[PDB]
Amino acid sequence: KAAEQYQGAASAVDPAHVVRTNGAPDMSESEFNEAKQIYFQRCAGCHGVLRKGATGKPLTPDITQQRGQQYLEALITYGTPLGMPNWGSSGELSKEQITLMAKYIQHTPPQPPEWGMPEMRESWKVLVKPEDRPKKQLNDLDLPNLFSVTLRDAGQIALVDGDSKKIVKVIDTGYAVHISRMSASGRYLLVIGRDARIDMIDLWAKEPTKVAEIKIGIEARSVESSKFKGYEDRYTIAGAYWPPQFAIMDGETLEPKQIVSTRGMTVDTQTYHPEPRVAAIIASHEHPEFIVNVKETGKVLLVNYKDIDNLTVTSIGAAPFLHDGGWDSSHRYFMTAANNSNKVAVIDSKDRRLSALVDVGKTPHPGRGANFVHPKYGPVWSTSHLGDGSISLIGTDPKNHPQYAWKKVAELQGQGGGSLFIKTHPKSSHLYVDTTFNPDARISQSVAVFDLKNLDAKYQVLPIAEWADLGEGAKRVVQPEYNKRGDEVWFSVWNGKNDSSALVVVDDKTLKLKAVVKDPRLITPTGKFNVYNTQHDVY
Amino acid sequence: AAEQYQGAASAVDPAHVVRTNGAPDMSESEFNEAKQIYFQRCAGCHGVLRKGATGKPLTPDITQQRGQQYLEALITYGTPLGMPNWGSSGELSKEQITLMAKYIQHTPPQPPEWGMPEMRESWKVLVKPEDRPKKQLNDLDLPNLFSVTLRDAGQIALVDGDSKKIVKVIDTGYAVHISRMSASGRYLLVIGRDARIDMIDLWAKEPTKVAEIKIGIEARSVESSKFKGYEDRYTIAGAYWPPQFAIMDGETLEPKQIVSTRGMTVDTQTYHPEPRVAAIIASHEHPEFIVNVKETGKVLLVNYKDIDNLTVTSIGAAPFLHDGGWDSSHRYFMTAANNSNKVAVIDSKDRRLSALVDVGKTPHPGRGANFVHPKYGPVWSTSHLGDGSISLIGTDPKNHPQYAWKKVAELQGQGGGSLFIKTHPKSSHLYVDTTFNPDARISQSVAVFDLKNLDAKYQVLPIAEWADLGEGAKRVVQPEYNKRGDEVWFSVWNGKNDSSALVVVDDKTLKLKAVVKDPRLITPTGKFNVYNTQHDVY
């Protein structure tokens, strides 16, 4: 009873300032659930689970009820020229459905489940123990030249032989794998689906097989392996969209070790954000750390794995909406993009600080970027954009080129906006740029190629989807990817689930069609990752 | 283009995202009546989001599972495991208990957040550092000044140690919880449970407030940088709500950084939406702050060498971290995980957890009592709320590795409800209060042990009786020494409409020495001697 009186006083919190949420328009279970289904299929990706993910005002009840039924139905119907699509004018949703959505966003956001250690371990499986695994490569495949390709809708991935252009093995994975990464030893291929399910693949088995699996959240996009000297296959890290967290696992078995929440204060307004999605993750070569990108709060975390029992995290503030990115030629500066902020953040991994914030085009989307030596400006890193057809070239040499370091030194012009990936290779004199989400079909089905030896000349357009000879379908071309020796660049002809797709290979030296990969199993091919280039960050 | 890029379906399954309800309808006045009772009477233990107490949380999934009558029966008779009986005792009516049962079946109302805009709005520089004196402009013996908390008055009082007279009363935040000193010994920092901080300059003609700021809706702790070369550099405060801490300029109180403590627990490793910040202590080994996060049981080492890019080492300990203090050497932070009945040892030099020592029912050491035991070498002690024991823990890894991090011995006091144990380098006595003991006589007195003869039973000093105050609970709390170490002060924490006092004792003879009374001395709780607080002398 002593301890009961000890903690018996009043909370300093004023009841009058703790508010009950409601005053929303009534809707039955049938109605409520219909809107909710529409919400996650059509709105969630941009607005988030708790409705604070997009730019502009959040869709939380304090704002929506203020605007009211009429204003909301009107906005959802026509959209806005700032990124909010029109759902009525386009015919996407009915007026009845839009009325449902306007009612829906006036209610408190339904809560998705959390996903801690018990859920994680439950989902964790070791298909093949480290003791039962081969001591050496048991197949005669040229693993470095293998291409891990995502059969998106199929929920699988395909290993494709670089030289033979044939599918060696198809593997079952999590739905719509987003990226593929290689372990520092070059033996394990890691893949993670948007459903947060990670699969570990042993390339040394007679036939490449899965040795371990785990689910690290409800939704996810990234995975990475420890690449610091003396830590080959030590730790594997993965970031989730929901819950706002990342998890560190055992490199050999994928055993859950640490789970860290990214919920926190933003870099810009320094206010609490309840859902800071984890974006890109890259492993440091300077220190035993993982460089994690936290989107909404716009934070770059340096997570030290030298001692995972007592995690040390350095939080570097950058700019809101961090997404993708990659290393500079030297592998010390993490050139990442804050897309909605129209900036590229530069993270000095050695000194562990924000080297600079570079102003670029509308909605930069570099992927891992493209590094090359410019005749006049020296070592540069480049990116294309979704908001425009420009290509930003940034100087990346502080030591021997202070005049150009962290400056948008020059621009190039491609086919137009809607670009996703820019590419090049050390042995190549060409720079590729795609246009996957360009509203023009011809431009979306082709790629622009620049001449590094003559950057003044306009690009050449390579008709990739046409070369494929596929037939009907949108046939969107996406992500150029070189092979081991960088003498051929690969592309994905991302056609529908019920249509026909292909991977088109081009001779880098002649810019001529070299081959086309077709297979009934090659369903919705998207990302392609060449083992050697992925593992050694060659781009 | 960007609209098609981010146009695919989210990987989250709509069928697993749940709408809350199925709660008993209650009008606006009924919900508000319940909500008021909940923060006046329940929140302290259960918390804002109802996940702060042991046992099952009071969230809709559980409360609706138990049902209306189960809840009414539980709130009415309580449980032997820490849940008070509100009906049986007669505290709440059956009509109110019915409202409470219905209330916790609804989603928890949400309190506002509190970020940088709110912080800067509340931030006030009263006297600019340039406009402040360059020397001490008064004749006060600052090191022997006591900062006393006049709880219900929302003020503190500076009492001259030798004269026993109130030197100045200052308006502060409501119910200040602790007083802390800047490393230079010039500024006094106080923080109210309402999260309002006040910085006081002791060098001014009359010690006065130079700055103030509010770092949350509810808080308890504050601290200053004590690493060499960092005097008055930064000030840190921990909040209960929102679940966070903030770092500010140690000269102006300007908010610089705010860090959320919401996260994963150390035991179950699941997400906890409300991990309150408990004690905070400044490191002498590195340029860091050692922060306790209660519910997740984490001790964070927040480095301030580069305040722009904050680096935090997260150390797991045990759930329900609360109060704690240094060992005689000032390298090991001895902190109590009260509900876990353990004392965590954080090595601030090597930056790791040295041990988890099993102690008694609900440890509550305050900052603890350090003293060299004649047999077991240097130890750090603590008393409890749950029982009448006093744990003695060895703290000497070098010269006494056999006793290091072991509950080496045990002393017995008057009983439970204890809150503070105390001693001093120059003293040979060990004091222990028993503030929340259900017996009036025990709670109005303190026990004293002879450190030169620990086998001998304690003496009982009738502190409240010595005060001669008349009616009231007259609960005595927290022993405190003067700089010389020859006087020990106690607070007679009576009601606000009653008479209170500060009883001072001759440590050398254990005889009454002085009694401080004043119409202004309302509900005197914590007392912090300037020097002893600044140099962590305990």
Ligand code: DHE
């Ligand atoms: C955070 C993130 C990364 C960086 C990973 C890293 O390196 O750690 C990334 C990379 C990638 C990469 C990496 C390529 C590389 O060369 O590194 C690929 C292939 C890719 C295929 C697609 N991405 Fe990606 N992508 C998102 C997020 C991300 N994508 C989205 O949230 C978004 C905007 C919406 C969505 O529906 O997921 C999105 C849409 C797409 C697509 O439309 C693609 C083409 C097909 C798909 O599966 O949705 N994203």
Ligand code: DHE
């Ligand atoms: C986190 C915390 C600390 C350590 C801070 C530090 O050292 O940096 C502390 C210390 C303290 C100290 C520090 C003394 C010391 O020697 O360091 C004092 C005097 C004190 C007076 C009280 N505390 Fe305290 N206390 C709480 C929290 C805390 N108290 C509570 O939440 C609790 C259990 C419930 C409440 O009502 O707030 C509580 C009740 C009390 C009381 O009942 C006291 C006697 C009067 C009051 O104002 O509530 N607390």
Ligand code: HEC
């Ligand atoms: C990204 C590709 C989006 C998708 C898909 C949807 N919305 Fe959106 N929405 C988006 C942006 C960037 C903005 C900002 C608009 C601006 O000009 O500032 C919005 C805004 C809204 C709003 C208005 C909020 C307000 O200002 O009060 C609403 C009500 C809204 N969006 C609704 C909504 C719904 C119901 C959607 C799916 C059916 C949806 N959005 C999808 C970006 C995107």
Ligand code: HEC
């Ligand atoms: C601490 C001093 C408390 C105060 C004040 C109140 N409660 Fe409590 N409560 C407390 C504990 C430690 C526990 C666990 C007890 C156990 O034996 O497990 C509880 C539990 C409850 C419950 C039952 C929860 C369940 O198991 O379903 C209820 C319904 C409950 N407490 C309600 C509640 C209310 C409404 C209170 C204020 C009027 C309240 N508690 C105060 C600790 C504390």
